[PDB]
């Protein structure tokens, strides 16, 4: 598709207005892959075309880039939703850099 183009452009995006109205969800375990992500997103986050400006699956550091409707909720939800327990692991989130950190934690 055309997700990878934006996952890359978003990875590098310098606009912090973006990283505020968006974050990379990191609850994707070794038992939870890209498709399952979205299901689970609409499943728990109630994500749709309304609350989500756009959603892309980030499977090279198991994350999910999500822009809810506003910066206040993206970070606020990050804090209230994450730090949870799912699939026998603790699920957490951050943005593009924090996901890269978590990635290290994943690959190592």
UniProtKB/Swiss-Prot annotation:
GO process annotations (BP): mRNA splicing, via spliceosome; spliceosomal complex assembly; spliceosomal tri-snRNP complex assembly
Location relative to the cell: Nucleus
The organism's taxonomic lineage, starting at the top: Eukaryota, Fungi, Dikarya, Ascomycota, Saccharomycotina
Self-association and partners: Monomer. Interacts with U6 snRNA SNR6 and the LSM2-8 complex (small nuclear RNA); to chaperone formation of the U4/U6-U5 tri-snRNP (small nuclear ribonucleoprotein) assembly, the protein is displaced from the U4/U6 snRNP once pairing is complete.
GO MF annotations in UniProt: RNA binding; snRNA binding; U6 snRNA binding
Predominant subcellular localization, coarse grouping: nucleus
Organism expressing this protein natively: Saccharomyces cerevisiae (strain ATCC 204508 / S288c)
Swiss-Prot/TrEMBL keywords: mRNA processing, mRNA splicing, Nucleus, Phosphoprotein, Repeat, RNA-binding
Protein name, per record: U4/U6 snRNA-associated-splicing factor PRP24
Residues of the whole record sequence present: 292 to 399 of 444
Recorded name of the encoding gene: PRP24
GO cellular component, as recorded: nucleus; ribonucleoprotein complex; spliceosomal complex; U6 snRNP
